[PDB]
């Protein structure tokens, strides 16, 4: 695992998230489910907890976007960069953006929303890219049935937030 410079870490254990918009690619319930599942991946192995907001600024603002979208890092069309997320902190920090020029799917027929979300949330929590090819934080993620957080990812996230309480 790799942890970001000067260890930007959330100073608190409870984080809020907000799904700002929805992709035409999928039913809204599929987007919500994929996000909830992605958050659970990290919650299960740390003391972190999450709750959802429908207004105001949540810690983790989640949105779909294309090309120029209000930050200095425009998306690049179909393929290549699939999404991006900012390290812990206020405002844009912690936020996650998903490139709608990808075809988001609940399975592996396009770009799997759950898997990419899980990876990006890793960034939102302070993890950087792993060298372990089997890690969720390896740049190169993609049998969803056989998905399992790697010990490397668990080691990395616990180095920041510790193991579950009890
Ligand atoms: Ca792209
Ligand atoms: Ca934020
Ligand atoms: Ca799309
Ligand atoms: Zn962006
Ligand atoms: Zn990444």
Swiss-Prot record:
Residues involved in Zn(2+) 2 binding: 119, 123, 129
Residues binding Ca(2+) 3, per UniProt: 76-77, 79, 81, 99, 102
Residues annotated to bind Zn(2+) 1: 69, 71, 84, 97
Subcellular location: Secreted, Extracellular space, Extracellular matrix; Nucleus; Cytoplasm
Family as reported in the entry's similarity comment: Belongs to the peptidase M10A family.
Comment text on domains: The conserved cysteine present in the cysteine-switch motif binds the catalytic zinc ion, thus inhibiting the enzyme. The dissociation of the cysteine from the zinc ion upon the activation-peptide release activates the enzyme.
Disease in which the protein is involved: Coronary heart disease 6: A multifactorial disease characterized by an imbalance between myocardial functional requirements and the capacity of the coronary vessels to supply sufficient blood flow. Decreased capacity of the coronary vessels is often associated with thickening and loss of elasticity of the coronary arteries.
Function, as annotated: Metalloproteinase with a rather broad substrate specificity that can degrade fibronectin, laminin, gelatins of type I, III, IV, and V; collagens III, IV, X, and IX, and cartilage proteoglycans. Activates different molecules including growth factors, plasminogen or other matrix metalloproteinases such as MMP9. Once released into the extracellular matrix (ECM), the inactive pro-enzyme is activated by the plasmin cascade signaling pathway. Also acts intracellularly.
Name assigned to this protein: Stromelysin-1
Gene source species: Homo sapiens
Gene it is expressed from: MMP3
């Amino acid at each position: 695992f790799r942890t970001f410079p000067g260890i930007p870490k959330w100073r608190k254990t409870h984080l809020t998230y907000r799904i700002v918009n929805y992709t035409p690619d999928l039913p809204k319930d599929a987007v919500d489910s994929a996000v909830e599942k992605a958050l659970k991946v990290w919650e299960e192995v740390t003391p972190l907890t999450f709750s959802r907001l429908y207004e105001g600024e949540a810690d983790i603002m989640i949105s779909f976007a294309v090309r120029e979208h209000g930050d200095f890092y425009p998306f690049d069309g179909p393929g290549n960069v699939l999404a991006h997320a900012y390290a812990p902190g206020p405002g844009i920090n912690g936020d996650a953006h998903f490139d709608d020029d990808e075809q988001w799917t609940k399975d592996t027929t396009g770009t799997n929303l759950f898997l990419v979300a899980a990876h990006e949330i890793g960034h939102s929590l302070g993890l950087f890219h792993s060298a372990n090819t089997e890690a969720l934080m390896y740049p190169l993620y993609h049998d969803l049935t056989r998905f399992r957080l790697s010990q490397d990812d668990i080691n990395g996230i616990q180095s920041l937030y510790g193991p579950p309480p009890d």
